């Protein structure tokens, strides 16, 4: 199906690419903006910026993109009752172009507030992007390609971190006189998506249930599937809709107060909190800050930075092989278990850092070992667990609690990491060592095996500890 390849590639290039891109495009123009932050504050109410609030303003610039994602996730529930899937992504790109023009024109306008507002509005684009695209590919693709398409959304996030770090080199787009043109190229994925996507048909499942366009649904289904015999595919959608409309939707507040699923909710929350508080996002936001403090002499940091994002892209195509052939529960304790170990081997490298010239180069290897552990393990399991503990009437009320901690914790790593770098000095990764160790320890005792098990056995394992037998 040639029409499916263009829809999947251009759909991820405009929205899922830009989430990965804006995770890593912030690290490389870091010494330029904090020089521009001081200049704009000096060409204003005039005192030099004290060193505490320069990093506080910079941490706000880094971490307010997470608040935009938190704001953006709540918006999709409002759009979902008024707009489609293709039309949402097209309308979502209004945030992408508007925020890209705000950050790229921050230096030309001479005001640094547009950079903070620009980061927040791009976060709204990213939060909507990660809440529509996993729903978008599932409806337009057959049931036997759904599992592999979870990789594809994750794959283009990896390339965005690669591209954002690749564009941050001094050779291409990362100079002092050039740095506003780093956020200005966010327009190009938005423009490319804005042309190809509206030509493609809408999501067939949305227009079937809500728009009542069975005649249009057949034409829409045949484009993505490439087959004439579609009658079995349509009748399955109405077969799912009669069950979906019959069940009573569980509200968000009822799920927290329900004693039957008490231990499943905290299992989702702690895993999702440790998914961000493990500190992988702290690597992307401040990679040159870590390598600058890890004994590495300068003028090669932008290329060592390029290695951190490079391994994740190659490890993401190995991730599905790891998911398929080993299990689900050994990966989660194994994932944060290797993180806490290699955070310790990270900590021992910057602690001495001066006993031999090859000691700082081990701190490189200690970081790709952390990144390879993420992609193989916790990279896509918290998203796939949350839809497995909970039933169909509880899944949209479960992803929202998984959604909000996924951005509040992400905002916590973004703001607090520069401050714990200043106090702990080398030992700043020992805090992140404790989170993954506590994450692996907690999931050792609470999490049961979730591969090839029905919902009844998953609930049965929690019923031993929940004590609220149905």
Between CA 209 and CA 207 the distance in angstroms is 6
Between CA 422 and CA 153 the distance in angstroms is 36
DSSP three-state, residue 404: helix
The residue among 55, 65, 6, 8 whose CA lies nearest residue 31 is 55
CATH class of 256-470: mainly alpha
Annotated resolution, angstroms: 3.4
For the chain, domain boundaries: 1-200, 256-470
Between CA 30 and CA 383 the distance in angstroms is 31
Between CA 124 and CA 68 the distance in angstroms is 4
Distance of alpha carbon 423 from the chain centroid: 28
DSSP three-state, residue 83: coil
DSSP three-state, residue 250: coil
**Experimental method reported for this structure:** cryo-EM
Contact between residue 271 and residue 382 where contact means Cβ atoms under 8 Å apart: yes
Contact between residue 393 and residue 249 where contact means Cβ atoms under 8 Å apart: yes
Distance of alpha carbon 31 from the chain centroid: 25
What are 359's two structure tokens? 């000691």
Q: Tally Cβ neighbours within 10 Å of residue 210.
A: 11
Domains 1-200 and 256-470 share a fold: yes
DSSP three-state, residue 468: coil
| Torsion angle in degrees (nearest 10) through CA of 221, 227, 231, 236 | -60
DSSP three-state, residue 235: helix
Chain breaks in the chain (C to N over 2.5 A) after: none
Between CA 376 and CA 134 the distance in angstroms is 20
Burial group, residue 87, by CB count within 10 angstroms (0-12, 13-18, 19+): middle
Residues 6+ apart with CB under 8 A from 400: 73, 252
Between CA 390 and CA 400 the distance in angstroms is 12
Q: Tokens 């001081």 map to which residue?
A: 38
Residues 6+ apart with CB under 8 A from 335: 373, 374, 376, 377, 378, 381, 440
DSSP states of 147-205 as a string?
HHHHHHHHHHHHHHHHHHHHTTSTTTT-STTTTHHHHGGGHHHHHHHHHHHHHS---HH
The residue among 18, 259, 42, 255 whose CA lies nearest residue 157 is 18
The residue among 379, 373, 312 whose CA lies nearest residue 150 is 379
Q: Tokens 């200043």 map to which residue?
A: 422
Q: Residues of 130-154 as b/e, b for ≥16 C-beta within 10 angstroms? A: bbbbbebbbbbbeeeeeeebbbbbb
Between CA 432 and CA 366 the distance in angstroms is 14
Between CA 9 and CA 152 the distance in angstroms is 9
Contact between residue 143 and residue 1 where contact means Cβ atoms under 8 Å apart: no
DSSP three-state, residue 135: helix
Contact between residue 417 and residue 428 where contact means Cβ atoms under 8 Å apart: yes
Query: How far is the first Cα of the chain from the last one, in angstroms, to the nearest whole number?
Result: 46
DSSP states of 299-366 as a string?
TSHHHHHHHHHHHHHHHHHHHHHHHHHT-SHHHHHHHHHHHHHHHHHHHHHHHH-SSSTTHHHHHHHH
* Architecture in CATH for domain 1-200: Up-down Bundle (1.20)
Burial group, residue 5, by CB count within 10 angstroms (0-12, 13-18, 19+): exposed
């Amino acid at each position: 199906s040639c029409s499916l390849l263009v829809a999947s590639l251009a759909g991820a290039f405009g929205s899922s690419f830009l989430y990965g891109y804006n995770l890593s495009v912030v690290n490389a123009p870091t010494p330029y903006i904090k020089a521009f932050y001081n200049e704009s504050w000096e060409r204003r109410h005039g005192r030099p910026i004290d060193p505490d609030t320069l990093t506080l303003l910079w941490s706000v610039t880094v971490s307010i993109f997470a608040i935009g994602g938190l704001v953006g996730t709540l918006i999709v529930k409002m759009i979902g009752k008024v707009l489609g899937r293709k039309h949402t992504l097209l309308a979502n790109n209004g945030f992408a172009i508007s925020a890209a023009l705000l950050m790229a024109c921050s230096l030309q306008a001479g005001a640094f507030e547009m950079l903070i507002v620009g980061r927040f509005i791009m976060g709204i684009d990213g939060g909507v992007a990660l809440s529509v695209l996993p729903m978008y590919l599932s409806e337009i693709s057959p049931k036997e390609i759904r599992g592999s398409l979870g990789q594809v959304t994750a794959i283009f996030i990896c390339i965005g971190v690669f591209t954002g770090q690749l564009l941050g080199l001094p050779e291409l787009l990362g100079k002092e006189s050039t740095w506003p043109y780093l956020f200005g190229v966010i327009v190009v994925p938005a423009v490319v998506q804005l042309l190809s996507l509206p030509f493609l048909p809408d999501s067939p499942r949305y227009l079937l249930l809500e728009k009542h366009n069975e005649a249009r649904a057949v034409k829409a289904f045949q484009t993505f599937l490439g087959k004439a015999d579609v009658s079995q595919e349509v009748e399955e959608v109405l077969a799912e809709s009669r069950v979906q409309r019959s069940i009573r939707l569980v509200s968000v507040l009822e799920l927290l107060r329900a004693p039957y699923v008490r231990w499943q909710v905290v299992t989702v929350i702690v895993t999702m909190a440790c998914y961000q508080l493990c500190g992988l996002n702290a690597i992307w936001f401040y990679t040159n800050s870590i390598f600058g403090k890890a004994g590495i002499p300068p003028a090669k940091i932008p290329y060592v930075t390029l290695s951190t994002g490079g391994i994740e892209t190659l490890a993401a195509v190995f991730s599905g092989l790891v998911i398929e052939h080993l299990g689900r529960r050994p990966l989660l304790i194994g994932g944060f278990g290797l993180m806490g170990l290699f955070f310790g081997t990270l900590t021992i490298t910057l602690t001495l850092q001066d006993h031999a010239p090859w000691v700082p180069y081990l701190s490189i290897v200690g970081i790709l070992a952390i990144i390879a552990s993420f992609c193989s393990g916790p990279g896509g399991i918290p998203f796939i667990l949350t839809g497995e503990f909970f039933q169909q009437s509880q899944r949209p009320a479960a992803f929202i609690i998984a959604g909000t901690v996924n951005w509040l914790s992400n905002f916590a790593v973004g703001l607090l990491f520069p401050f714990i770098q200043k106090s702990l000095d080398t030992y700043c990764f020992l805090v992140f060592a404790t989170i993954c160790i506590t994450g692996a320890i907690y999931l050792y005792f609470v999490l049961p095996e979730t591969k090839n098990r029905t919902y009844a056995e998953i609930s049965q394992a929690f019923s031993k500890r929940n004590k609220a037998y149905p």
